[PDB]
Design a protein around this ligand. Structure first.
Ligand SMILES: [Co+2]
Length: 269
């Protein structure tokens, strides 16, 4: 049997723009159970993340006044985000087409799935992804990433950018004098990957390298086998400076690294 998935079920009776896929945040659809689920997830992550999340992340939660006890009102959050870096969040139904996603980031809009899991949802997207948007260097990286979507689409290279996004914005680590810390949203919203990625001898921790990353496969249904480590958000922004077109064409011919591979030139940590 095939039953409707959570995206389908949650969006019953709702609409979205056929071109940009946004909708007003449907506040009336959040039940008491939704707010309680949010509060439980927020409490869980805030207990586990000190000394694991990068300090900027935890500061962003506070500066944006991300609600601890209910699903946040996007408009209220936007008042703080806009004043900090000129970014805003927009509600979307769930996963959206790549060219739409890139167009949003290129215009300093961060798409956030509106609905919550039952006890890539609103907790993952808002709690995991949004706090670092108050950091001007990280925000500029996302904008530059977005702006690259047009060229990538024209060259059939969106999956090569998707690898960069996955291994930075979703699953990135940042080294600090106090020890390795986490900035990837997929880790920051996770119950246990937050532990494994810092504490386990199992995964590879490899120094950030743009070409290497864009040549690296990833898998979505398991903890990462490789994490890429930056020294600064400036390293991410600076990585977007050159022309990606000849990088894409070089990679198009190559065999990608597997998700668990170590490459000959890796700086291994
Ligand atoms: Co994500």
């Amino acid at each position: 049997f095939v039953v409707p998935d959570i995206t389908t079920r949650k969006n019953v009776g709702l609409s979205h723009d056929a071109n940009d896929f946004t909708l007003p945040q449907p506040l009336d659809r959040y039940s008491a159970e939704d707010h309680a689920t949010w509060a439980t997830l927020y409490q869980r992550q805030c207990k586990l993340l000190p000394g694991r999340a990068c300090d900027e992340f935890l500061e962003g939660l506070e500066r944006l006044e991300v609600d601890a006890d209910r699903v946040p009102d996007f408009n209220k959050l936007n008042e703080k985000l806009m004043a900090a870096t000129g970014w805003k969040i927009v509600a979307v139904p769930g996963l959206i087409p790549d060219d739409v996603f890139f167009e949003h980031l290129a215009n300093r809009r961060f798409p956030v799935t509106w609905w919550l899991r039952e006890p890539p949802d609103v907790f993952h997207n808002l709690f995991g992804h949004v706090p670092l948007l108050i950091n001007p260097v990280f925000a500029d990286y996302l904008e530059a990433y977005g702006k690259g979507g047009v060229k990538a689409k024209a060259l059939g290279a969106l999956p090569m950018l998707a690898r960069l996004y996955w291994y930075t914005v979703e699953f990135g680590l940042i080294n600090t004098p106090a020890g390795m810390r986490i900035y990837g949203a997929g880790i920051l919203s996770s119950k246990s990957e937050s532990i494994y990625c810092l504490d386990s001898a199992s995964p590879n921790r490899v120094g950030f390298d743009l070409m290497r990353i864009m040549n690296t496969r990833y898998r979505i249904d398991t903890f990462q086998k490789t994490y890429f480590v930056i020294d600064s958000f400036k390293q991410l922004f600076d990585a977007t400076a050159p022309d990606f077109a000849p990088l894409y064409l070089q990679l198009a011919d190559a065999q990608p690294w597997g998700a668990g591979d170590i490459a000959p030139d890796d700086l291994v940590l």
